[PDB]
Amino acid sequence: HWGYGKHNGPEHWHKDFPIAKGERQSPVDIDTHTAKYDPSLKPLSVSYDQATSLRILNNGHAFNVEFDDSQDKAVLKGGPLDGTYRLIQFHFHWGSLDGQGSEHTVDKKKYAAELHLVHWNTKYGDFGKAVQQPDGLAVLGIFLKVGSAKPGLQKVVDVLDSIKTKGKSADFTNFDPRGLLPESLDYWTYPGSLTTPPLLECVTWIVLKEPISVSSEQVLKFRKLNFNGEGEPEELMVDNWRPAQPLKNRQIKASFK
Ligand SMILES: CC1(C)OB(c2ccc(NS(N)(=O)=O)cc2)OC1(C)C
């Protein structure tokens, strides 16, 4: 199956997922000088006060902190979005070294990692129906740089030892995602897709300009995870990021300056 290795990596995905060479694929490089301020954008609203996490899972590609989305809690709206989008899960993409790891890039700069908070448009009933629509999903992307530790990320870092291999999961309740947000909500936005197979083009990307800082120790533990399942040759879970894709006919809008 698909992965990030030499024989099943990003350059191979198009064979089983033709949309990989589509017209609105993600991620993309964000040319800050070409991005245009858009006054038509309404204030971005991130309301995670009632967010209820359920568990954390190593799916062999990354680890997902899943949330209970059966009720109107943890919602993203405003900005380029029409209606309400509900948080369903978040995960990260990171590198084998601090100099790489992010999927989106800023003026070609690669950050150490990137956090993806996934939300589905509530007008579609559920996530399954949402991914069949051009505006079914909204992913809030946040860059991670190595420096000071991010207090709010430690609970995630400490449970990773219990889900080292593919298929393992652990209870992960009462985690507050607000502890992973930077100060400013300044962002860039554009229409894109999932960055992992099936690469569906149903995503409105909202990428924050301000990255959060995490310690070398915290990201080092991310790199201790495995892509493989238990009892299999160990393949460290690193560099699970897709490189920048062609922008084609899309414009990146800025919410600031
Ligand atoms: C509800 C789940 C867990 O959510 B998802 C999913 C899959 C891939 C995904 N990648 S990304 N890098 O674009 O954020 C983001 C979300 O599909 C399902 C497996 C249906």
Ligand SMILES: [Zn+2]
């Ligand atoms: Zn992602």
